[PDB]
Amino acid sequence: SMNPPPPETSNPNKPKRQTNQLQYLLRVVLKTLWKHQFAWPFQQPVDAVKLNLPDYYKIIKTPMDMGTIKKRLENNYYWNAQECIQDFNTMFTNCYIYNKPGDDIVLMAEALEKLFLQKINELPTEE
Ligand SMILES: Cc1noc(C)c1-c1cc(O)cc([C@H](O)c2ccccc2)c1
């Protein structure tokens, strides 16, 4: 079956603003995760056709990935840090839901998530 359209990264009817926390999420958080050796499966949407996973989009109803997050940060899609953090969390949770504990893909997601949480603990104050 065909892949769904990817999550939107532009919508003029969505409100948005720049905040120092959103700048940090791009310049520090995304940047650090993007270059991790285990980033590559998370850098674009799951292509279930390419991966031959007929069931993926029956199980994962709210797909998210770092390619989408990157474009949302770069294109000023977000209103606040919480919206972006939620996208990261959806990405990690989808991987844990779809796959099994201890699978390679899960260990990769877990390594990224550990870093992610280190980085979010250093989220600057809104200023
Ligand atoms: C990410 C992710 N969450 O569920 C799936 C499936 C993926 C996923 C996304 C991809 O681009 C590639 C793969 C691939 O099968 C794999 C990569 C590394 C180690 C083990 C396997 C899985």
PDB file of C-alpha atoms and ligand atoms in Angstrom:
ATOM      1  CA  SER A   1       0.000   0.000   0.000  1.00  0.00           C
ATOM      2  CA  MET A   2       1.065   3.631  -0.600  1.00  0.00           C
ATOM      3  CA  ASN A   3       2.771   5.716   2.108  1.00  0.00           C
ATOM      4  CA  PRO A   4       0.702   8.507   3.637  1.00  0.00           C
ATOM      5  CA  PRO A   5       1.682  12.112   2.930  1.00  0.00           C
ATOM      6  CA  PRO A   6       4.357  13.116   5.401  1.00  0.00           C
ATOM      7  CA  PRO A   7       3.469  15.293   8.352  1.00  0.00           C
ATOM      8  CA  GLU A   8       2.949  18.909   7.246  1.00  0.00           C
ATOM      9  CA  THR A   9       5.865  21.347   7.664  1.00  0.00           C
ATOM     10  CA  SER A  10       3.977  24.465   6.359  1.00  0.00           C
ATOM     11  CA  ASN A  11       0.479  25.728   7.159  1.00  0.00           C
ATOM     12  CA  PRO A  12      -0.325  29.398   7.071  1.00  0.00           C
ATOM     13  CA  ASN A  13      -3.400  28.792   9.284  1.00  0.00           C
ATOM     14  CA  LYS A  14      -1.239  27.464  12.099  1.00  0.00           C
ATOM     15  CA  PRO A  15       0.129  30.099  14.496  1.00  0.00           C
ATOM     16  CA  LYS A  16       3.882  30.276  15.194  1.00  0.00           C
ATOM     17  CA  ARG A  17       6.620  32.352  16.812  1.00  0.00           C
ATOM     18  CA  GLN A  18      10.345  32.234  17.445  1.00  0.00           C
ATOM     19  CA  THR A  19      11.430  31.596  21.026  1.00  0.00           C
ATOM     20  CA  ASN A  20      14.899  31.088  22.521  1.00  0.00           C
ATOM     21  CA  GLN A  21      13.808  27.552  23.448  1.00  0.00           C
ATOM     22  CA  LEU A  22      12.846  26.750  19.847  1.00  0.00           C
ATOM     23  CA  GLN A  23      16.188  28.214  18.640  1.00  0.00           C
ATOM     24  CA  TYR A  24      17.967  25.929  21.146  1.00  0.00           C
ATOM     25  CA  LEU A  25      15.953  22.922  19.935  1.00  0.00           C
ATOM     26  CA  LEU A  26      17.246  23.577  16.392  1.00  0.00           C
ATOM     27  CA  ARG A  27      20.786  24.798  17.018  1.00  0.00           C
ATOM     28  CA  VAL A  28      21.655  22.410  19.835  1.00  0.00           C
ATOM     29  CA  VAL A  29      19.171  19.552  20.205  1.00  0.00           C
ATOM     30  CA  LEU A  30      18.407  18.624  16.574  1.00  0.00           C
ATOM     31  CA  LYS A  31      22.015  19.325  15.548  1.00  0.00           C
ATOM     32  CA  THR A  32      23.449  16.969  18.184  1.00  0.00           C
ATOM     33  CA  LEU A  33      20.946  14.160  17.443  1.00  0.00           C
ATOM     34  CA  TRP A  34      21.274  14.489  13.643  1.00  0.00           C
ATOM     35  CA  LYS A  35      24.989  13.644  13.623  1.00  0.00           C
ATOM     36  CA  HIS A  36      24.801  10.679  16.001  1.00  0.00           C
ATOM     37  CA  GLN A  37      25.974   7.473  14.332  1.00  0.00           C
ATOM     38  CA  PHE A  38      22.465   5.966  14.938  1.00  0.00           C
ATOM     39  CA  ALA A  39      20.474   8.909  13.519  1.00  0.00           C
ATOM     40  CA  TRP A  40      20.017   7.756   9.928  1.00  0.00           C
ATOM     41  CA  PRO A  41      16.790   5.649  10.303  1.00  0.00           C
ATOM     42  CA  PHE A  42      15.135   8.645  11.980  1.00  0.00           C
ATOM     43  CA  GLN A  43      16.225  11.307   9.446  1.00  0.00           C
ATOM     44  CA  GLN A  44      13.176  10.838   7.160  1.00  0.00           C
ATOM     45  CA  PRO A  45       9.699   9.377   7.365  1.00  0.00           C
ATOM     46  CA  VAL A  46       9.337   5.545   7.535  1.00  0.00           C
ATOM     47  CA  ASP A  47       9.018   4.424   3.916  1.00  0.00           C
ATOM     48  CA  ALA A  48       6.950   1.284   4.457  1.00  0.00           C
ATOM     49  CA  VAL A  49       7.036   0.482   0.732  1.00  0.00           C
ATOM     50  CA  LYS A  50      10.884   0.507   0.653  1.00  0.00           C
ATOM     51  CA  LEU A  51      11.047  -1.442   3.926  1.00  0.00           C
ATOM     52  CA  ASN A  52       8.242  -3.862   2.943  1.00  0.00           C
ATOM     53  CA  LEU A  53       6.141  -3.295   6.083  1.00  0.00           C
ATOM     54  CA  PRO A  54       2.505  -3.675   4.970  1.00  0.00           C
ATOM     55  CA  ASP A  55       1.300  -3.170   8.555  1.00  0.00           C
ATOM     56  CA  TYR A  56       3.327  -0.083   9.579  1.00  0.00           C
ATOM     57  CA  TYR A  57       0.676   2.554   9.026  1.00  0.00           C
ATOM     58  CA  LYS A  58      -2.022   0.293  10.537  1.00  0.00           C
ATOM     59  CA  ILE A  59      -0.076   0.236  13.779  1.00  0.00           C
ATOM     60  CA  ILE A  60       1.564   3.685  13.746  1.00  0.00           C
ATOM     61  CA  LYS A  61      -1.197   6.238  13.228  1.00  0.00           C
ATOM     62  CA  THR A  62       0.835   9.350  14.202  1.00  0.00           C
ATOM     63  CA  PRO A  63       4.171   8.973  12.282  1.00  0.00           C
ATOM     64  CA  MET A  64       6.961  11.406  13.098  1.00  0.00           C
ATOM     65  CA  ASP A  65      10.653  11.668  12.289  1.00  0.00           C
ATOM     66  CA  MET A  66      13.630  14.054  12.643  1.00  0.00           C
ATOM     67  CA  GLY A  67      13.534  15.111   8.944  1.00  0.00           C
ATOM     68  CA  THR A  68      10.066  16.501   9.614  1.00  0.00           C
ATOM     69  CA  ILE A  69      11.159  18.081  12.901  1.00  0.00           C
ATOM     70  CA  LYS A  70      14.126  19.687  11.164  1.00  0.00           C
ATOM     71  CA  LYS A  71      11.914  21.246   8.516  1.00  0.00           C
ATOM     72  CA  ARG A  72       9.386  22.374  11.143  1.00  0.00           C
ATOM     73  CA  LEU A  73      12.140  24.108  13.153  1.00  0.00           C
ATOM     74  CA  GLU A  74      13.805  25.642  10.037  1.00  0.00           C
ATOM     75  CA  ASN A  75      10.409  26.791   8.565  1.00  0.00           C
ATOM     76  CA  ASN A  76       9.138  28.288  11.867  1.00  0.00           C
ATOM     77  CA  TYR A  77       6.173  25.885  12.136  1.00  0.00           C
ATOM     78  CA  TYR A  78       6.028  25.759  15.935  1.00  0.00           C
ATOM     79  CA  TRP A  79       4.353  27.941  18.550  1.00  0.00           C
ATOM     80  CA  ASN A  80       6.332  26.591  21.454  1.00  0.00           C
ATOM     81  CA  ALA A  81       8.985  24.153  22.661  1.00  0.00           C
ATOM     82  CA  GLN A  82       6.347  21.723  23.896  1.00  0.00           C
ATOM     83  CA  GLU A  83       5.034  21.194  20.344  1.00  0.00           C
ATOM     84  CA  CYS A  84       8.567  20.241  19.139  1.00  0.00           C
ATOM     85  CA  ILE A  85       9.374  18.073  22.191  1.00  0.00           C
ATOM     86  CA  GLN A  86       6.051  16.228  21.628  1.00  0.00           C
ATOM     87  CA  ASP A  87       7.144  15.431  18.043  1.00  0.00           C
ATOM     88  CA  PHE A  88      10.434  13.921  19.377  1.00  0.00           C
ATOM     89  CA  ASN A  89       8.533  11.930  21.943  1.00  0.00           C
ATOM     90  CA  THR A  90       6.060  10.647  19.275  1.00  0.00           C
ATOM     91  CA  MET A  91       9.010   9.570  17.174  1.00  0.00           C
ATOM     92  CA  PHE A  92      10.627   7.581  20.023  1.00  0.00           C
ATOM     93  CA  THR A  93       7.338   6.096  21.231  1.00  0.00           C
ATOM     94  CA  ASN A  94       6.354   4.965  17.681  1.00  0.00           C
ATOM     95  CA  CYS A  95       9.635   3.047  17.403  1.00  0.00           C
ATOM     96  CA  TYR A  96       9.080   1.350  20.777  1.00  0.00           C
ATOM     97  CA  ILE A  97       5.480   0.495  19.887  1.00  0.00           C
ATOM     98  CA  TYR A  98       6.217  -0.910  16.415  1.00  0.00           C
ATOM     99  CA  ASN A  99       9.351  -2.879  17.318  1.00  0.00           C
ATOM    100  CA  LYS A 100      10.364  -5.278  20.127  1.00  0.00           C
ATOM    101  CA  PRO A 101      12.436  -4.572  23.251  1.00  0.00           C
ATOM    102  CA  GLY A 102      16.155  -5.042  22.513  1.00  0.00           C
ATOM    103  CA  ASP A 103      15.752  -4.883  18.678  1.00  0.00           C
ATOM    104  CA  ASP A 104      18.626  -2.981  17.077  1.00  0.00           C
ATOM    105  CA  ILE A 105      16.249  -0.173  15.987  1.00  0.00           C
ATOM    106  CA  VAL A 106      15.000   0.191  19.561  1.00  0.00           C
ATOM    107  CA  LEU A 107      18.583   0.370  20.957  1.00  0.00           C
ATOM    108  CA  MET A 108      19.291   3.084  18.394  1.00  0.00           C
ATOM    109  CA  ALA A 109      16.137   5.016  19.390  1.00  0.00           C
ATOM    110  CA  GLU A 110      17.079   4.569  23.072  1.00  0.00           C
ATOM    111  CA  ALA A 111      20.599   6.050  22.444  1.00  0.00           C
ATOM    112  CA  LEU A 112      19.107   9.071  20.704  1.00  0.00           C
ATOM    113  CA  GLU A 113      16.469   9.460  23.417  1.00  0.00           C
ATOM    114  CA  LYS A 114      19.086   9.408  26.217  1.00  0.00           C
ATOM    115  CA  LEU A 115      20.922  12.245  24.481  1.00  0.00           C
ATOM    116  CA  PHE A 116      17.679  14.014  23.847  1.00  0.00           C
ATOM    117  CA  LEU A 117      16.748  13.961  27.521  1.00  0.00           C
ATOM    118  CA  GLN A 118      20.234  15.235  28.539  1.00  0.00           C
ATOM    119  CA  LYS A 119      19.661  18.129  26.109  1.00  0.00           C
ATOM    120  CA  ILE A 120      16.089  18.934  27.251  1.00  0.00           C
ATOM    121  CA  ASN A 121      17.246  18.969  30.908  1.00  0.00           C
ATOM    122  CA  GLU A 122      19.449  21.923  29.791  1.00  0.00           C
ATOM    123  CA  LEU A 123      16.581  23.735  28.047  1.00  0.00           C
ATOM    124  CA  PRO A 124      17.149  27.428  28.647  1.00  0.00           C
ATOM    125  CA  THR A 125      14.575  29.605  30.398  1.00  0.00           C
ATOM    126  CA  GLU A 126      12.123  31.387  28.088  1.00  0.00           C
ATOM    127  CA  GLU A 127      13.578  34.887  27.688  1.00  0.00           C
TER     128      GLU A 127
HETATM  129  C1  LIG B   1      12.900   4.277  12.715  1.00  0.00           C
HETATM  130  C2  LIG B   1      12.020   3.056  12.619  1.00  0.00           C
HETATM  131  N1  LIG B   1      10.972   2.705  13.444  1.00  0.00           N
HETATM  132  O1  LIG B   1      10.355   1.468  12.936  1.00  0.00           O
HETATM  133  C3  LIG B   1      11.111   1.156  11.785  1.00  0.00           C
HETATM  134  C4  LIG B   1      10.705   0.024  10.909  1.00  0.00           C
HETATM  135  C5  LIG B   1      12.103   2.054  11.606  1.00  0.00           C
HETATM  136  C6  LIG B   1      13.135   1.948  10.585  1.00  0.00           C
HETATM  137  C7  LIG B   1      13.374   3.022   9.776  1.00  0.00           C
HETATM  138  C8  LIG B   1      14.378   2.914   8.793  1.00  0.00           C
HETATM  139  O2  LIG B   1      14.644   3.955   8.024  1.00  0.00           O
HETATM  140  C9  LIG B   1      15.123   1.730   8.608  1.00  0.00           C
HETATM  141  C10 LIG B   1      14.840   0.654   9.424  1.00  0.00           C
HETATM  142  C11 LIG B   1      15.666  -0.641   9.296  1.00  0.00           C
HETATM  143  O3  LIG B   1      14.752  -1.746   9.267  1.00  0.00           O
HETATM  144  C12 LIG B   1      16.662  -0.765  10.463  1.00  0.00           C
HETATM  145  C13 LIG B   1      17.604   0.271  10.703  1.00  0.00           C
HETATM  146  C14 LIG B   1      18.586   0.117  11.703  1.00  0.00           C
HETATM  147  C15 LIG B   1      18.682  -1.041  12.441  1.00  0.00           C
HETATM  148  C16 LIG B   1      17.748  -2.096  12.249  1.00  0.00           C
HETATM  149  C17 LIG B   1      16.722  -1.943  11.255  1.00  0.00           C
HETATM  150  C18 LIG B   1      13.838   0.754  10.428  1.00  0.00           C
END
